[PDB]
Swiss-Prot record, chain A:
It comes from the Bacteria. This is Colicin-E7. This plasmid-coded bactericidal protein is an endonuclease active on both single- and double-stranded DNA but with undefined specificity. Residues 60-111 are annotated as: Disordered. Signal peptide: none annotated. Residues 89-102 have a biased composition (Basic and acidic residues). Belongs to the colicin/pyosin nuclease family. The chain holds residues 447 to 573 of 576 of the full protein. It comes from Escherichia coli. Zn(2+) binds at residues 98, 123, 127.
UniProtKB/Swiss-Prot annotation, chain B:
Keywords: Bacteriocin immunity, Plasmid. It comes from the Bacteria. Coiled coil: none annotated. The keyword Lyase does not apply. This is Colicin-E7 immunity protein. The gene is imm. One of its GO terms (molecular function) is toxic substance binding.
């Protein structure tokens, strides 16, 4: 969980509305273009992965354009973008990374094909 | 950037200053201070979209401090609410 590891997976192609369906079922998948930048890279912890993940989003010319300037600034420094106010939940006001298969069951900490992006509300509902 | 009690105590320029402080805290390692500034932003503007004006700006206006001030001014004016201090 908080232990190092290599990221893997292919991810999926996405449109100009990547996070549109993020409070859906399993949310939005890791963009294929993002998985290529992260694949086979060693991370200290999942937190380190998440930080790099969002940085890559801000760096991807196609995805960054789907976010406002302030959103892009956050992600650049490794912070998850803020969700629309309607999708928040308490102090959880930003998109969260979800593991389809929990770390305990089958695990898959850095398996980008087991990671998706969901809103705080969706994460609570799926749980 | 003293947090005023009302948008009426804020000149437009002062509100812009508050927005740049928010942009500064928006790139910090934590959101503790940021969330306080955002809450204040929501309270004073009283805009129904709250912080979405910052993170999810309408494409019919500039995504910048000026665009945010403009949308706030137009919404408050259209609703007969007191606006920014002329100073």
């Amino acid at each position: 969980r908080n232990k190092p590891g290599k990221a893997t997976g292919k991810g999926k192609p996405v449109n100009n509305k990547w996070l549109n369906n993020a409070g859906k079922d399993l949310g939005s998948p890791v963009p294929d273009r993002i998985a290529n930048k992260l694949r086979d890279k060693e991370f200290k912890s999942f937190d380190d992965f998440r930080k790099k993940f969002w940085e890559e989003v801000s760096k991807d010319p196609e995805l960054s354009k789907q976010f406002s300037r302030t959103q892009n600034d956050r992600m650049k420094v490794g912070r998850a973008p803020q969700t629309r106010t309607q999708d928040v939940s308490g102090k959880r006001q930003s998109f969260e990374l979800h593991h389809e298969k929990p770390i305990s069951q089958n695990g898959g900490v850095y398996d980008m094909d087991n990671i998706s992006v969901v809103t705080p509300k969706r994460h609570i509902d799926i749980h | 950037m003293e947090l005023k009690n009302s948008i009426s105590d804020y000149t437009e320029a002062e509100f812009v200053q508050l927005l740049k402080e928010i942009e500064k805290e928006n790139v910090a390692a934590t959101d503790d201070v940021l969330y306080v500034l955002l809450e204040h932003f929501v309270k004073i503007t009283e805009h129904p979209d709250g912080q979405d004006l910052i993170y999810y700006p309408s494409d019919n206006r500039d995504d910048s401090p000026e665009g945010i001030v403009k949308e706030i001014k137009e919404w408050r004016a259209a609703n007969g609410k007191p606006g920014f201090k002329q100073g």
